[PDB]
Amino acid sequence: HHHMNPLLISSGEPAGIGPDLCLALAETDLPVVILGDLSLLEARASELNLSIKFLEYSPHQSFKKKAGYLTVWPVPCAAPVISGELNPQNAAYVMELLTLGASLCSKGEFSALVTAPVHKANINAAGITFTGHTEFFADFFEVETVVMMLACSQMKVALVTTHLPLRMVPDAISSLLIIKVIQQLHHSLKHDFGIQSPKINVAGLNPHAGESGYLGREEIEIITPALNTLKNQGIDVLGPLPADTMFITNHINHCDAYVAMYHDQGLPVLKYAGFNEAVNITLGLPIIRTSVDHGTALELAGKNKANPGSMLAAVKMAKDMALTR
Ligand SMILES: NC(=O)c1ccc[n+]([C@@H]2O[C@H](COP(=O)([O-])OP(=O)(O)OC[C@H]3O[C@@H](n4cnc5c(N)ncnc54)[C@H](O)[C@@H]3O)[C@@H](O)[C@H]2O)c1
Numbered sequence: 001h002h003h004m005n006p007l008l009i010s011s012g013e014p015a016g017i018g019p020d021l022c023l024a025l026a027e028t029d030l031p032v033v034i035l036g037d038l039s040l041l042e043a044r045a046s047e048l049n050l051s052i053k054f055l056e057y058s059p060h061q062s063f064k065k066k067a068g069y070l071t072v073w074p075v076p077c078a079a080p081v082i083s084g085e086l087n088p089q090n091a092a093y094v095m096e097l098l099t100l101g102a103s104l105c106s107k108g109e110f111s112a113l114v115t116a117p118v119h120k121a122n123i124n125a126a127g128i129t130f131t132g133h134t135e136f137f138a139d140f141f142e143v144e145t146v147v148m149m150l151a152c153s154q155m156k157v158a159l160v161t162t163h164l165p166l167r168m169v170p171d172a173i174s175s176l177l178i179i180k181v182i183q184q185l186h187h188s189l190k191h192d193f194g195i196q197s198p199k200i201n202v203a204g205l206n207p208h209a210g211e212s213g214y215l216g217r218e219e220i221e222i223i224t225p226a227l228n229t230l231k232n233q234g235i236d237v238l239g240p241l242p243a244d245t246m247f248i249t250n251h252i253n254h255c256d257a258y259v260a261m262y263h264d265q266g267l268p269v270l271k272y273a274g275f276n277e278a279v280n281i282t283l284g285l286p287i288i289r290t291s292v293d294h295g296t297a298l299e300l301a302g303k304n305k306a307n308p309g310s311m312l313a314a315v316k317m318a319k320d321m322a323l324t325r
């Protein structure tokens with residue numbers, strides 16, 4: 001073909017805003033193909049009073065996207081969808097979108113995967129153990145270390161640990177894990193974001209980075225040794241820093257990415273600064289995968305209230321990465 005192979009969009013939890021966000025792509029010229037139930041997409045468009053012409057995907061049709069059309073790779077829900085109403089019978093459908101999306105991108109049929117939001121509890125309620133797309137894709141591709149990084153114009157925040165109960169965070173953090181996470185972060189910033197010598201600022205685990213060992217020992221026993229190892233590999237880390245002020249910039253503390261030890265240590269600030277522009281990108285897979293930075297927003301499904309800014313940013317980032325692959 002002439003144009004790039006299209007981006008594949010998993011439409012996510014069907015009762016949530018994922019379908020709505022995919023329908024918002026119909027008015028763009030972004031080269032996207034939607035994985036989802038075609039009847040669902042048509043019915044959601046009707047509920048939203050949108051006039052969209054749907055095409056079924058074919059590899060023998062043009063990769064150039066035209067406004068007003070939406071190309072779909074149909075995957076059938078087990079049961080018809082009611083907006084805002086979770087149905088555990090459709091959890092396997094969601095997992096099929098993830099599995100088919102990973103597989104089709106792995107084979108090069110599509111140039112990148114973008115994920116609309118999924119409802120984790122609904123998947124688990126159906127009997128499918130699931131902590132997030134990030135771990136699902138790591139397992140699918142048999143990659144030991146992947147990194148969740150949220151990115152916006154204000155900042156990039158990578159996580160050492162992702163979806164864990166807070167009780168499990170300290171035991172999950174080892175020096176080796178920090179090293180492997182930051183090695184992947186450094187590699188991606190240099191090779192995929194064009195940052196020649198990344199500067200990475202790293203939070204401590206404990207308040208005030210453990211208060212010189214008086215408020216937890218993990219900085220002394222785990223984090224600082226890991227950062228020393230990374231420095232001696234030539235990776236320009238600074239830390240451990242207190243998370244409550246690390247995100248405040250000054251004339252000298254500039255960095256290319258922050259590392260937070262756990263989910264709620266880093267994501268609240270990032271989403272406060274850039275919720276409607278930020279992208280969740282998974283580092284370390286053999287495919288490009290980006291994501292919205294928000295959840296299913298079930299109460300907004302079918303209501304024309306959700307902001308498509310994160311989805312649009314996620315598609316554009318995936319496109320930019322695919323063009324520079
Ligand atoms: N990438 C993903 O698949 C992903 C990411 C985050 C959360 N989730 C899942 O989503 C479900 C809901 O969790 P939550 O309630 O913590 O997250 P959420 O983002 O669904 O809701 C948080 C708040 O943000 C609002 N919101 C979310 N997206 C919005 C948008 N595009 N425009 C306007 N307002 C928006 C919601 O109305 C709500 O007030 C959970 O199952 C969670 O695991 C999935």
Ligand SMILES: [Zn+2]
Nearest residue numbers: 162163263267
């Ligand atoms: Zn989360």
